[PDB]
Design an enzyme around this catalytic site. Sequence first.
Site, mmCIF file in Angstrom:
data_model
loop_
_atom_site.group_PDB
_atom_site.id
_atom_site.type_symbol
_atom_site.label_atom_id
_atom_site.label_comp_id
_atom_site.label_asym_id
_atom_site.label_seq_id
_atom_site.Cartn_x
_atom_site.Cartn_y
_atom_site.Cartn_z
ATOM 1 N N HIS A 162 0.847 -1.308 -0.104
ATOM 2 C CA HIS A 162 -0.021 -0.006 0.067
ATOM 3 C C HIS A 162 0.870 1.216 0.176
ATOM 4 O O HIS A 162 2.184 1.095 -0.047
ATOM 5 C CB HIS A 162 -0.687 0.067 1.185
ATOM 6 C CG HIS A 162 -1.888 -1.249 1.538
ATOM 7 N ND1 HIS A 162 -2.863 -1.355 0.672
ATOM 8 C CD2 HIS A 162 -1.537 -2.281 2.034
ATOM 9 C CE1 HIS A 162 -3.638 -2.482 0.854
ATOM 10 N NE2 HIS A 162 -2.839 -3.264 1.745
ATOM 11 N N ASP A 204 -1.361 8.691 -1.255
ATOM 12 C CA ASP A 204 -1.291 9.661 -2.277
ATOM 13 C C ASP A 204 -2.293 11.000 -1.826
ATOM 14 O O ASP A 204 -3.584 10.686 -1.515
ATOM 15 C CB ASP A 204 -1.920 9.107 -3.774
ATOM 16 C CG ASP A 204 -2.360 10.446 -4.852
ATOM 17 O OD1 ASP A 204 -2.196 11.781 -4.614
ATOM 18 O OD2 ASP A 204 -2.758 9.808 -5.782
ATOM 19 N N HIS A 238 -4.044 14.493 -2.177
ATOM 20 C CA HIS A 238 -4.232 15.417 -3.295
ATOM 21 C C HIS A 238 -4.072 16.966 -2.515
ATOM 22 O O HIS A 238 -3.865 17.678 -3.286
ATOM 23 C CB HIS A 238 -5.941 15.615 -3.626
ATOM 24 C CG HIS A 238 -6.268 14.205 -4.366
ATOM 25 N ND1 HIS A 238 -7.438 14.138 -5.041
ATOM 26 C CD2 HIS A 238 -5.523 13.223 -4.700
ATOM 27 C CE1 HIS A 238 -7.565 13.054 -5.562
ATOM 28 N NE2 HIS A 238 -6.417 12.343 -5.933
ATOM 29 N N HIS A 263 -5.923 9.120 -0.857
ATOM 30 C CA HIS A 263 -6.025 7.431 -1.200
ATOM 31 C C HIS A 263 -4.868 6.707 -1.528
ATOM 32 O O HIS A 263 -3.801 7.292 -1.601
ATOM 33 C CB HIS A 263 -7.325 7.534 -2.372
ATOM 34 C CG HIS A 263 -6.552 7.893 -3.481
ATOM 35 N ND1 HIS A 263 -6.032 7.127 -4.571
ATOM 36 C CD2 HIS A 263 -6.730 9.179 -4.185
ATOM 37 C CE1 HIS A 263 -5.556 7.961 -5.627
ATOM 38 N NE2 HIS A 263 -5.946 9.082 -5.421
ATOM 39 N N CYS A 264 -5.076 5.401 -1.310
ATOM 40 C CA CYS A 264 -3.842 4.512 -1.777
ATOM 41 C C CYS A 264 -3.882 4.416 -3.142
ATOM 42 O O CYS A 264 -4.811 4.609 -3.760
ATOM 43 C CB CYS A 264 -4.224 3.047 -1.183
ATOM 44 S SG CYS A 264 -2.982 2.056 -1.352
ATOM 45 N N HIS A 317 -7.703 -0.827 -5.143
ATOM 46 C CA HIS A 317 -7.341 -0.358 -3.761
ATOM 47 C C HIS A 317 -8.309 0.825 -3.150
ATOM 48 O O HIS A 317 -8.722 0.883 -2.346
ATOM 49 C CB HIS A 317 -5.705 0.060 -3.666
ATOM 50 C CG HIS A 317 -5.122 -0.986 -3.659
ATOM 51 N ND1 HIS A 317 -4.292 -1.357 -2.369
ATOM 52 C CD2 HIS A 317 -4.714 -2.150 -4.330
ATOM 53 C CE1 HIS A 317 -3.575 -2.526 -2.609
ATOM 54 N NE2 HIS A 317 -4.019 -3.013 -3.793
ATOM 55 N N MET A 374 -9.795 2.335 0.341
ATOM 56 C CA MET A 374 -8.820 2.980 0.699
ATOM 57 C C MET A 374 -8.782 4.746 0.333
ATOM 58 O O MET A 374 -8.121 4.826 -0.603
ATOM 59 C CB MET A 374 -7.621 2.440 0.382
ATOM 60 C CG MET A 374 -7.578 0.921 0.618
ATOM 61 S SD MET A 374 -5.644 0.364 0.747
ATOM 62 C CE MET A 374 -5.037 1.066 2.245
ATOM 63 N N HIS A 413 -27.500 15.870 -1.448
ATOM 64 C CA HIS A 413 -28.573 16.627 -1.281
ATOM 65 C C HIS A 413 -29.156 16.650 0.095
ATOM 66 O O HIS A 413 -29.240 15.428 0.513
ATOM 67 C CB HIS A 413 -29.754 16.534 -2.341
ATOM 68 C CG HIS A 413 -31.184 16.851 -1.894
ATOM 69 N ND1 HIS A 413 -31.507 18.392 -2.543
ATOM 70 C CD2 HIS A 413 -32.143 16.369 -1.362
ATOM 71 C CE1 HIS A 413 -32.833 18.194 -2.215
ATOM 72 N NE2 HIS A 413 -32.980 17.341 -1.414
ATOM 73 N N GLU A 433 -29.779 23.455 -3.603
ATOM 74 C CA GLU A 433 -30.516 22.242 -3.397
ATOM 75 C C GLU A 433 -29.709 20.954 -3.525
ATOM 76 O O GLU A 433 -29.890 20.001 -2.453
ATOM 77 C CB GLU A 433 -31.592 22.263 -4.553
ATOM 78 C CG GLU A 433 -31.546 22.016 -5.831
ATOM 79 C CD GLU A 433 -32.691 22.212 -6.750
ATOM 80 O OE1 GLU A 433 -33.624 21.432 -6.491
ATOM 81 O OE2 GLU A 433 -32.610 22.854 -7.881
ATOM 82 N N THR A 434 -29.127 20.614 -4.616
ATOM 83 C CA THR A 434 -28.267 19.775 -4.872
ATOM 84 C C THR A 434 -26.887 20.078 -5.316
ATOM 85 O O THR A 434 -26.590 21.212 -6.073
ATOM 86 C CB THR A 434 -29.000 18.692 -5.865
ATOM 87 O OG1 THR A 434 -30.198 18.619 -5.347
ATOM 88 C CG2 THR A 434 -28.081 17.447 -6.035
ATOM 89 N N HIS A 473 -28.651 12.507 -5.083
ATOM 90 C CA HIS A 473 -29.902 12.720 -5.457
ATOM 91 C C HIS A 473 -30.021 12.129 -7.142
ATOM 92 O O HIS A 473 -30.742 12.482 -7.999
ATOM 93 C CB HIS A 473 -30.013 14.143 -5.685
ATOM 94 C CG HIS A 473 -31.736 14.289 -5.510
ATOM 95 N ND1 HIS A 473 -32.540 13.958 -6.500
ATOM 96 C CD2 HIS A 473 -32.311 14.847 -4.430
ATOM 97 C CE1 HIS A 473 -33.861 14.162 -6.222
ATOM 98 N NE2 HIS A 473 -34.032 14.838 -4.936
#
Lengths: 333, 333, 333
Positions: C87, C90, C92, C127-128, C137, C142, C247, C271-272, C298
Amino acid sequence: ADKLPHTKVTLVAPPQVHPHEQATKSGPKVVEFTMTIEEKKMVIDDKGTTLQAMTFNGSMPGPTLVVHEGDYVQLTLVNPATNAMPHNVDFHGATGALGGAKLTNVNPGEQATLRFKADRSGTFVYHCAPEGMVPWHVVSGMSGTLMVLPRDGLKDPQGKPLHYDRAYTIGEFDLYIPKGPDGKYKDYATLAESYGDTVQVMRTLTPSHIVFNGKVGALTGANALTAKVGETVLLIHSQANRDTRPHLIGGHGDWVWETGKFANPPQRDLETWFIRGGSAGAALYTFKQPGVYAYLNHNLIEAFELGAAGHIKVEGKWNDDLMKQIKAPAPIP
Amino acid sequence: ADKLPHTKVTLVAPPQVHPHEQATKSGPKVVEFTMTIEEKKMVIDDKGTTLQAMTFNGSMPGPTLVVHEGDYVQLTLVNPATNAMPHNVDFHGATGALGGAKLTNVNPGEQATLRFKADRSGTFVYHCAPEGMVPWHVVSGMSGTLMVLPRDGLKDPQGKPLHYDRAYTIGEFDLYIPKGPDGKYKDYATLAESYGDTVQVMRTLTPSHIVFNGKVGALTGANALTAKVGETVLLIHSQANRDTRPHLIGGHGDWVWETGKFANPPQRDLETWFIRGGSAGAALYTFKQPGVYAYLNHNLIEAFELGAAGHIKVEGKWNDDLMKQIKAPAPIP
Amino acid sequence: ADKLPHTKVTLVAPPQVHPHEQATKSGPKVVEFTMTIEEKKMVIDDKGTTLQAMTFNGSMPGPTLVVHEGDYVQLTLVNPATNAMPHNVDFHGATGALGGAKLTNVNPGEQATLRFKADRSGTFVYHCAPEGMVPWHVVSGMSGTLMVLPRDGLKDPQGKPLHYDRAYTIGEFDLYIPKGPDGKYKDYATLAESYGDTVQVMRTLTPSHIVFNGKVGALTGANALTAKVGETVLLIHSQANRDTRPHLIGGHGDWVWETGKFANPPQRDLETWFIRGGSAGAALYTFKQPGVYAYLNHNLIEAFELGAAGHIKVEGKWNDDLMKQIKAPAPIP
Ligand SMILES: [Cu+2]
Ligand SMILES: [Cu+2]
Ligand SMILES: [Cu+2]
Ligand SMILES: [Cu+2]
Ligand SMILES: [Cu+2]
Ligand SMILES: [Cu+2]
Ligand SMILES: [Zn+2]
Ligand SMILES: [Zn+2]
Ligand SMILES: [Zn+2]
């Protein structure tokens, strides 16, 4: 709210929107509407495919309801005894009780009246949401738009006034029509018999059809939208269940609220915008060229193969400055 | 427009973009381009799968055309007699006549010249759109970008100047390659024979491959994009048919116009942005670390399994302030 | 960074987020975290379906890590010998070396320590991403969120202060569980045996389940989120692989950073909203009505059929001004 004047609005069928003011000198009102649910089998394409449909007011989408920020919406929702299912309404424009769904549960033969404060400006989805069968009622056609206009009308990012001369309302519907072992779409004698097979298709996440206003070609031919050079149109686009990406072929979104909420600054000059599943968005465009435009979902498979496309026929004088055919198609020299 | 100077531009193949000014002292010009359509069978993956492809200028995407706001684009579109199909072009950057498609219908052996005013800044899709076969021509490879730069160059949300030192153009293509009963992809002797089977796959809405610039691994190895620490790159990303979500692994979108229209303020510090099917977007990034980056669609299935990923190889000096390996992988104490 | 004070943070399991300041008078720190990878078979629905899962800290999503802009994140990543796979991680939120993945490759029995500067505010996916098996993964569980708060706290578009009284973290997971010829989901004895069949399902781009925090109904019943009228909640929503559209039923996104980056102005009254696959977004909402809300994706099929929905139970006094049942369901007169 109990101190305020009441007004009653008569709704009109899509793609039109009922007469209303944009900027208004009027103070807040309780604005009264009524809608009647209609379950019905509808033909949705050119080859006779049917949908066991569910509608507000007999149309897909339901009609658009227009009020101003600070108004109260008071809706009487009627479920005639001729229908087979219970229904309700969830207004994304409302606050509390699952959008009003918990307060409007109507069995066939019943009706209810809901009031809520329209305290937020924008275009907002409304849809049926009966416990345990929410997605089925939505994808079978039970959704429409509530537009809450700012009391002083639309504004650009610098706070300058914006307006439209005509409003059109487009509901886009991802449909999930089952097939039999012969590969032909199934026709069901009743709404209840469509249920199990339809849930199976829904779960594939792949629509059989995607249509504007209830049918392939609904907004074409005699039923095309219309405008004229110099006129500004508002295009309201609702999709209660699935994402879409509207585009006007040969045009633009001059000013677009893709998330549909008017207190946010619009974006300008858009080629294609994005309506999140479970929302309504709004685009302004001022026509500069006459001719027939297409207005479509720019997943072009979804538009041309599945049905998510309409036409706008525009009167007026051609502008050679904007576009000119220098040399017509001719043999390569 | 008939009063203005003309300039002729020589296009270059993706991922490069033809030489151009950003901010310019020049006044409006009629900017002349020519493109020649090429239908051809292309190998699109590592296992020899073929696509019966359709291209502007022999590449997927077609080349990027760059002008300034207020310029006129004058394109000569040539369809050689060696091609089997009629074609045209629809510029999302243009106003009227379905983006110019109605004025550029060229049978094999024909050519046409279209002029339009580039009156709106941004990156805009252009694509073929022949009546009755629009999605097929688009998904088979007929799309590219027109970039219309503001006359005074790019600006941040506060109106401060922005620039790039190098521009790259990435066209992402959702491909719909049919399989036979043996489960292997079908190879077709002609473009016409691919049609019916391909429409069937298209209708499933599930791409068999999703590729940058015409093939799995197109932008990798010898063909990786390049840059250096301190350099600002513009990444133009077009997707004429389907949504994508670009991401630079180990980097960011410093300034991003995800809807691709430069008169709108960009967003900053993005991890992943969204390009609506039927649009081109633009991201600026200034490299701060050397190494090999991935630039990909962050549906990681679409990237790693289906092909929507490329590489950028970046020269320069490592920055321990930004990132440091405190302890290398070692046995747990 | 070698000049700065260190602090150590104890992580808490989702949906909670570890105690932290919003606006702070503190200067930059090296903030130390540790996470331990756990591979495990998890039951993900009401009918006993299992996932051969991979987790940070034994939960889906991994815990949320909170720092301030200008802090340095220093993570010790431990891969116990009881696990079968290598594993890494990463971020972001980080700059360089594929988000740190290249510097944290840990075989079972190993651990590594990574430092990076959190120089950009926002919610960011981590994330992996092990070479050659990235999407597997990620979809097996992950991923999680790093939140980097501006040193002076959240701000509205006019630069006015914003805050939350409680933070919840929701990881949404598109799962790809294979079926056997009998149509029942497959149960695998080991993680490695799930691989080939799972890749096949992944390639269809159709999730079998889509779940919040590791299971259908994870955020319901005893495990519903909670709040009170007058309280402002932050809802962090991460989706490391696939788009979603959050939502709040009966509510709104009062202030939303859908792309999740706090230096950009939020949108109001949503709303969304839309979380791009490969990103985390953030929404603020102040409750005005008591009751049970749903918080969901939604695409209502994805929510109700596939599992992407949770509940928030809210204490307090009902507001008749905002919403009133004028007439309860009763027979049509
Ligand atoms: Cu209903
Ligand atoms: Cu809803
Ligand atoms: Cu063509
Ligand atoms: Cu187009
Ligand atoms: Cu892993
Ligand atoms: Cu990533
Ligand atoms: Zn029967
Ligand atoms: Zn043949
Ligand atoms: Zn075994």
